[PDB]
Design a protein around this ligand. Structure first.
Ligand SMILES: *[C@@H](CS(=O)(=O)Oc1ccc([N+](=O)[O-])cc1)[C@H](CCc1ccccc1)NC(=O)[C@H](Cc1ccccc1)NC(=O)OCc1ccccc1
Length: 215
């Protein structure tokens, strides 16, 4: 695979968002992945709705948690593969309470046909990402509250509890790393991003990787 890949360089990644006091990380991970995949399928980069999932995805638990894989399936099986634009269904769960699901007054910004679950291997995840784009991954974010910048060479890897988005990697640097987009505003980390060492399963990054497929 390529020595280094950064999808932000190809204009495939939207701006960093804010999940607020809502434990809706899984929704930001799933939607961030869809946004990138939609763009890569030959459509203009569009901001999609995390609120749609938090409010309408009943197979998940809104601000109490959820799984990216459940979200991908809900979109396909229950919402006719549609994903609304963020402008038509704005985020309103930052206070910690998700408003009821509304089935009208929204515009479809993208559609997906399914999803694939990637192998639990960093080299294999990197290979898929280099060709197919950003991947939704679950990580242990225990040591992330104190993160201020730089490449994290040591990360607590015990329990998956957070959903984020892998946008790239750099194998040519002193210590190879992954580039990850977080949803805790641009004030956190490196303008909303975090770099963790690659190759030693830092933060359990290879455990639950997946991506939506837009036919
Ligand atoms: C994401 C949470 S976060 O709070 O933004 O992340 C963050 C990480 C770590 C810390 N920390 O160590 O201090 C602080 C902040 C989200 C939180 C959900 C939540 C809300 C309130 C209380 C506890 C938890 N985490 C999830 O939604 C996980 C993400 C995940 C984990 C493993 C594999 C894939 C995705 N999911 C989760 O808890 O799902 C439970 C569930 C399963 C099935 C159906 C419904 C819910």
């Amino acid at each position: 695979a390529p020595a280094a890949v950064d999808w932000r360089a190809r204009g495939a990644v939207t701006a960093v968002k804010d999940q607020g006091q809502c434990g809706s990380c899984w929704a930001f991970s799933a939607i961030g992945n869809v946004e990138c995949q939609w763009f890569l399928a030959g459509h203009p980069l569009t901001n999609l709705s995390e609120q749609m999932l938090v409010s309408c995805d009943k197979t998940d638990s809104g601000c109490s948690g959820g799984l990216m894989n459940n979200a991908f399936e809900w979109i396909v099986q229950e919402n006719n593969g549609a994903v609304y634009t963020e402008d038509s269904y704005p985020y309103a769960s930052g206070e910690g309470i998700s408003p009821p699901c509304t089935t009208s007054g929204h515009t479809v910004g993208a559609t997906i046909t399914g999803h694939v679950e990637l192998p639990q291997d960093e080299a294999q995840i990197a290979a898929w990402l280099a060709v197919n784009g950003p991947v939704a991954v679950a990580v242990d974010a225990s040591s992330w509250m104190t993160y201020t910048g730089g490449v994290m060479t040591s990360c607590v890897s015990e329990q998956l509890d957070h959903g984020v988005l892998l946008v790239g990697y750099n194998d040519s640097a002193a210590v190879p790393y992954w580039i990850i987009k977080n949803s805790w505003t641009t004030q956190w980390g490196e303008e909303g991003y975090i770099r963790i060492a690659k190759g030693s399963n830092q933060c359990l990054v290879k455990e639950e990787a997946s991506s939506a497929v837009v036919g």
